[PDB]
Amino acid sequence: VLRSVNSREPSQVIFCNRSPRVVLPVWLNFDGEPQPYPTLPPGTGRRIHSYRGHLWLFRDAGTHDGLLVNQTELFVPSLNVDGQPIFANITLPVYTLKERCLQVVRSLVKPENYRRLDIVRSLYEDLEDHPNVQKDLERLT
Amino acid sequence: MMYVKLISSDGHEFIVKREHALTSGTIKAMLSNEVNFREIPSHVLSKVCMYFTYKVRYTNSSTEIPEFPIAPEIALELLMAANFLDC
Amino acid sequence: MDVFLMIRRHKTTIFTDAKESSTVFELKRIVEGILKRPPDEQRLYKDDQLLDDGKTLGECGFTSQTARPQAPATVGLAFRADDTFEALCIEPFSSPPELPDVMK
Numbered sequence: 001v002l003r004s005v006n007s008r009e010p011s012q013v014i015f016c017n018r019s020p021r022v023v024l025p026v027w028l029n030f031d032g033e034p035q036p037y038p039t040l041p042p043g044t045g046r047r048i049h050s051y052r053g054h055l056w057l058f059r060d061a062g063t064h065d066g067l068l069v070n071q072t073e074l075f076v077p078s079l080n081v082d083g084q085p086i087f088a089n090i091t092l093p094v095y096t097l098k099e100r101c102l103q104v105v106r107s108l109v110k111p112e113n114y115r116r117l118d119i120v121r122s123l124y125e126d127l128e129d130h131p132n133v134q135k136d137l138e139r140l141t
Numbered sequence: 142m143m144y145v146k147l148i149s150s151d152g153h154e155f156i157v158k159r160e161h162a163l164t165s166g167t168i169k170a171m172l173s174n175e176v177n178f179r180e181i182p183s184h185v186l187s188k189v190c191m192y193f194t195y196k197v198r199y200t201n202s203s204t205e206i207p208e209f210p211i212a213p214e215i216a217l218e219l220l221m222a223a224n225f226l227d228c
Numbered sequence: 229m230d231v232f233l234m235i236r237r238h239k240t241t242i243f244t245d246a247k248e249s250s251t252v253f254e255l256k257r258i259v260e261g262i263l264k265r266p267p268d269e270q271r272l273y274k275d276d277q278l279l280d281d282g283k284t285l286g287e288c289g290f291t292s293q294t295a296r297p298q299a300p301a302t303v304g305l306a307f308r309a310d311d312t313f314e315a316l317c318i319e320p321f322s323s324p325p326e327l328p329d330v331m332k
């Protein structure tokens with residue numbers, strides 16, 4: 001369902017990482033498989049060659065936490081006007097306090113030890129159910 | 142302006158905009174102008190209030206969003222509170 | 229520009245914002261609306277320094293980029309009981325426990 005269209009019409013894009021995370025751009029290929037691309041350090045940008053109708057999303061490279069691009073989940077390169085590239089502004093979401101706490105806890109506790117934490121079983125499940133692109137594709141479908 | 146009082150387990154009284162506290166569906170339920178939290182100490186509830194301000198300020202805003210900071214020492218308790226308050 | 233504050237006295241903490249261009253006195257009016265005490269029964273402080281009514285919050289060092297939504301700046305508050313002002317007392321927040329072993 002969610003997949004890039006094989007349009008063959010070039011579109012030049014700037015991936016602009018305005019987050020404090022290392023960014024993993026993910027291209028959804030013509031069969032809908034996520035293809036990872038080179039990472040972007042915090043605050044950096046890359047001018048890249050993509051195509052109209054192609055689908056992209058953006059993740060924290062280390063944790064797979066979800067990021068926004070032009071304020072939304074998916075970015076689709078448009079027609080370039082006057083030879084100008086399309087800007088893809090990658091930013092942090094306003095995470096819920098719960099998701100933000102899960103992130104921090106996941107960053108300090110090796111997954112084998114989630115179970116040693118003194119919390120209700122459902123929070124163990126929340127920790128183990130870490131962000132993943134496949135899960136988000138099944139949702140977004 | 143309408144404020145509400147959120148009181149920590151150790152007796153610290155946090156006064157915040159009603160609108161901000163309604164971020165939390167649990168707090169909304171506890172109001173329908175003061176709520177006592179017997180399990181949430183002040184080092185946690187103070188951060189919860191800071192989150193409300195942060196959320197209201199940065200929700201639907203194109204100005205770059207900074208990371209919401211959480212010290213390791215409070216992360217577990219803050220997680221538990223966030224789960225209770227559904228925020 | 230908005231500045232984000234915690235106005236603190238004893239075990240009371242008010243979360244609010246104000247303009248960088250707003251005055252100390254105008255902040256007392258805000259406190260008055262919440263705690264029901266007039267500006268002349270209030271002293272405001274930055275750390276140990278007593279703030280003058282006529283100064284802007286900016287002049288007194290509360291700026292948009294240091295008094296942030298997620299890390300607000302602290303303004304101390306003291307009340308006058310009868311004739312004389314109490315000393316500035318801000319009860320600290322509780323202490324986090326030791327990090328569990330699995331978080332080290």
Ligand SMILES: Cc1ncsc1-c1ccc(CNC(=O)[C@@H]2C[C@@H](O)CN2C(=O)[C@@H](NC(=O)C2(F)CC2)C(C)(C)C)cc1
Pocket residue numbers: 006007008009015025027037038039040046048049050051054
């Ligand atoms: C350097 C860099 N850093 C972060 S991402 C990145 C980057 C590095 C290389 C590229 C090269 N461009 C591509 O791979 C584009 C992106 C996406 O639209 C798919 N793509 C293609 O060229 C695809 N080609 C096509 O669709 C066509 F050739 C039929 C037009 C591929 C070869 C993968 C089938 C793009 C971005």
